[PDB]
Amino acid sequence: HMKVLILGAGNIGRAIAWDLKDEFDVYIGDVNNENLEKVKEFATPLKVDASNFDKLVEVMKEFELVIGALPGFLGFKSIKAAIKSKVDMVDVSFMPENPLELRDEAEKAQVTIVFDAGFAPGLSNILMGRIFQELDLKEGYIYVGGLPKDPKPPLYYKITWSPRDLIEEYTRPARVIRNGKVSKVDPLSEVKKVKIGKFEFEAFISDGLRSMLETINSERLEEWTLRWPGHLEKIKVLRELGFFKPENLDFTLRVIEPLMRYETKDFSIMKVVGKGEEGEMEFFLYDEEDSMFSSMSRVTGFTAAIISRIVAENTCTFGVIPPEILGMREDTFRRIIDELKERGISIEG
Amino acid sequence: HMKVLILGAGNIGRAIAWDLKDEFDVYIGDVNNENLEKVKEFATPLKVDASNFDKLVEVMKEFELVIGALPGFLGFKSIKAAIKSKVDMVDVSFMPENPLELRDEAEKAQVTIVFDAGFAPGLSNILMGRIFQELDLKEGYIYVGGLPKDPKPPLYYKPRDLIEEYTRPARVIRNGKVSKVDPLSEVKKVKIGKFEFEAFISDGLRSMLETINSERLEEWTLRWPGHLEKIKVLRELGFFKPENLDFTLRVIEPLMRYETKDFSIMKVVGKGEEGEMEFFLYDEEDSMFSSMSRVTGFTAAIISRIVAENTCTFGVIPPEILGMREDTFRRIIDELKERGISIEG
Ligand SMILES: NC(=O)c1ccc[n+]([C@@H]2O[C@H](COP(=O)([O-])OP(=O)(O)OC[C@H]3O[C@@H](n4cnc5c(N)ncnc54)[C@H](O)[C@@H]3O)[C@@H](O)[C@H]2O)c1
Ligand SMILES: NC(=O)c1ccc[n+]([C@@H]2O[C@H](COP(=O)([O-])OP(=O)(O)OC[C@H]3O[C@@H](n4cnc5c(N)ncnc54)[C@H](O)[C@@H]3O)[C@@H](O)[C@H]2O)c1
């Protein structure tokens, strides 16, 4: 079993570790011990600060694969480290910067990096890429949400993944492709009711499309994030009052985060729609928290691990590769769907 | 000629001194030199710490009237000090405690204390008092606001005392009894004149709760639209909890701090077995004083004159009593008019 290093022992990172524990000798580095304590049984913990770049690259030379599960602010650097250190990487962090900026350096260094390998982006992109190949795509829609099974006031949401990254969904523009071009909207500004199966949600346009903006050529492309009602209106007022400004964000989170940390199971819901000249395609996912992990962890984490296997297998070329590429080729797409099913994540359509 | 002592050179304390400046020999005491400085041209400042009861009574002994313009936490003590000093006092501090508590002591001391002598409570009490006598009153309504003439987003208003209104229970009279309600539970839309407002129940009735024998009594405080919906959310999420409050203010104080002109408005309505009575007033900021300062400070100043004139009896008198008397009520109304404050009805 080859050596693998996962950066970050957060909820996502721990799930990736669990999934890969018997196929690789996995090492997971984090800066927080309490989190590392959680993983000693299945991975070998390392005290690592991804913050320190020259130091990080040194740790990297030992391994043949790195998987990134850091907070978003730290991701671009880790990618940089991997490339300098010449190790293949699969990254899940919700980084603000664009990984494709690093494409040349990656190609030259002959390593392959797959970024945004989570639930959405990630599996989200992969399904779209598939639709993109199978259809002469005109319009694409993604509806996605990680939600609490039993929502509760006052915020009706359960925190399952990094909150700093989460607030960003509300705080910056969301881009879409309208009339064939990229366009920006205020996410908070247009919220609508959508019903999917039994559920009634409020949906807002979000900035999850990411690489798909350049990658998927269609007239219309939008991703909508799903929420229980009552959540967004409250968030909007906070934003309006400046509570999300960087100066106060830490303080505001301290207040609100506890409200969103109550006991409930969580679920994952995704719907992907593709419209073409002759036909439409629709994919659907519903997942729930298992005994060990939240759905968000399962879906984001297992998807990354599955992708990691694909990379370790040498399937892919050098450079920085968007996750939707994986969708576009049949062998890779099918494998992903199959592995997901193995793990109880059933994607339909 | 008559020597008068004002406790606190704050906005209100300052307005009052200004009003009485020609008529009385007015001295004003504070711990804060900056405020003391603002007032030295029309009154004589003194350094007095209201915290010190024994020192307070000693200073008071030199005066024939004391006017209280302190913070609420110091108010009850000031009244006590005046009683011991045997000096009449008019108090405008928004103290938590009930002054009526000191009623026997004041009576024994042969002094007159009028309390809650401001705009609301105060003038509002006086107007309602008129109505209580004139009408067989069953329902009484008071609407009051101190607002920016020009409101800016997101708050639409221009600190702790303000939040406290959102936070604490308010008392009303329902079915002839006192009940406590959440101030934010019943937000309402009301229009007065050319004005569209949002209102919430407030805790201003106070003395009137015992004093006005009525089936329904409520005080509603007015806000420009779009302010309280935001306020409710912040409370809901815990931003108003005491541990978090300091930071919350830091975030939201600035929003409500912008250049504009304030104004004061009041509408008092009384409903009776036969007939309805109603009063209204609108005031604006001026060259020297905000509207709030003018309406509050003047009313207190006017009341002081009445007290200094030996109109009243011994003891602790709720302001509504001044309303209940025709002579007193007229004088107040008339004096207000001279100062540019017109009340109609
Ligand atoms: N594509 C998607 O669906 C999706 C979904 C969920 C999470 N994510 C992304 O996955 C990344 C992590 O996910 P999470 O929710 O597990 O994050 P988390 O915030 O739960 O934990 C982040 C982990 O990184 C560790 N860490 C922070 N700075 C570090 C440092 N200097 N050195 C070593 N460790 C450090 C933290 O200690 C923590 O253990 C985030 O970028 C998140 O945005 C993406
Ligand atoms: N009924 C109403 O409409 C109404 C309206 C406005 C104010 N008020 C009440 O009037 C009181 C003062 O009103 P303001 O708005 O002028 O107050 P403000 O807070 O502007 O100033 C209070 C003044 O009290 C002085 N002071 C504080 N502690 C002192 C101490 N230990 N010794 C000497 N002085 C001290 C301060 O130094 C300041 O000068 C407060 O109880 C307020 O609640 C009532």
From TrEMBL, chain B:
It comes from the Archaea. NAD(+) 1 binds at N11, I12, D30, D49, A50, L70, F94, A120, P121. NAD(+) 2 binds at I12, D30, V31, D49, A50, L70, F94, F119, A120, P121, D161. One of its GO terms (molecular function) is nucleotide binding. Residues 118-341 form the Saccharopine dehydrogenase-like C-terminal domain. Residues 4-114 form the Saccharopine dehydrogenase NADP binding domain. InterPro entries: AASS, NAD(P)-bd_dom_sf, Sacchrp_dh-like_C, Sacchrp_dh_NADP-bd. Keywords: Nucleotide-binding, Oxidoreductase. This is Saccharopine dehydrogenase. It comes from Pyrococcus horikoshii (strain ATCC 700860 / DSM 12428 / JCM 9974 / NBRC 100139 / OT-3).
